[PDB]
Write a protein that binds this DNA or RNA. Sequence first.
RNA 1: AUAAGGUGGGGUUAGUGA
Lengths: 50, 147, 219, 50
Amino acid sequence: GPEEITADIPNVGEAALSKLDESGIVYIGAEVTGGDILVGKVTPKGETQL
Amino acid sequence: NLTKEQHEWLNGWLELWGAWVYSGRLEKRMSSVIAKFMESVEPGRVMTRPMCNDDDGMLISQVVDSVMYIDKKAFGILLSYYAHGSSKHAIASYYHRVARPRKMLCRGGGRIQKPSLATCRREVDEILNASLFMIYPVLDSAFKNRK
Amino acid sequence: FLKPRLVDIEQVSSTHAKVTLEPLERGFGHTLGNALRRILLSSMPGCAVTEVEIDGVLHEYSTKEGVQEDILEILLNLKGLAVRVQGKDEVILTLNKSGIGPVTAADITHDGDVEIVKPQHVICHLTDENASISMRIKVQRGRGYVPASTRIRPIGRLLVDACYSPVERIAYNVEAARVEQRTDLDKLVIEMETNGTIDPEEAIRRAATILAEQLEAFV
Amino acid sequence: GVLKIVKVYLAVKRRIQPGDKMAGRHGNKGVISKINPIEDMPYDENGTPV
RNA sequence: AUAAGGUGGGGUUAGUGA
């Protein structure tokens, strides 16, 4: 399968989730530090498409 | 003794905990091909146990240290149960092998033996049954204290 | 021994002035010269700008339609903005200005407790017939040089550096006094340089207050 | 083989710190050693710091 | 601890006064 861009993630806290949009992208101008998450990218491992 | 819902809720937090600390394992194995061998197959057994964030796992680490610092045996079997994920009977075997003929005097008589593997089960079980009951109101306030 | 006293504060200009200390013994002109120079440059209470929230702006590295200047030049112009506050320890100021022309210091919504000192200090030029700026300028007390990174939340809140220092330039001069029938006595003359936010007698009195508190520490 | 690329521009402000190389126009190099407060500078009779 | 990582080419930095 493909890979996805949205703000859905497994198992991180709401701290990094505070600074994304509804699409999973940081707003313009949100000041960030090291180790913060810019774009939540996930892979569907185990997608079927059967 | 604690209740059923408490056993559930606390049990979920603890498996997230030992899952989290188990990720701080010293070293694994793997290779340099297997990842390439891995992304284009469906594995089957997803061994990826889910864990909490670092805030919760650190916090309840402070909790479990905060009560369980007094007994290192009970702490050790606690990490055996959630960290390694090993069963009660398995550490009944590990523990029973080296329980040490410490000359415990039974209701049978003066004896020089390990207490049995039939003994060592309820040995284990009364430990963590009390232990969760000890740590539960502390932790249940602890999420509320952050709250 | 004797003790010096204030004889004069020569208010030579609006910005700065010269005070006079007299009489003194040997070395104490140089002693309090280096001393009070070092204290007056050291630490006075300041009233700097703290942070500015200009309205339609996400962040400092962008522009605004209707002004010739960048945001960055604007808030660095605000870093030099001096002001006097009396009754508070922090305050929020507000400006609203439209129409073609320069943006002076006069366009803030003044209060009775806050007081700008230099009305002519420009900020920017509006170039559009119909555009405006509306920022809120947070201003608090303080002491010393505080960068923005060493501190400690909505994205419109920009930051500045803190330059809590009213003073600019200190010079002292010793010479002999003209005392009655006596030599070896000393007129101390001190030249300070102030933006305009601090009166001199208050300044040196605060300085010697600090210095007495520091000699307090063992005897 | 790629579906979408997301470019992010991050903006840094850098001031100065003891250990930076800064130099004139005569081969006179220099690593900046100590940021020393104002009161310890040399100063003329007029009072201006160097 | 999921940022990792071979091969070429180019550019730069630091290396005396007799």
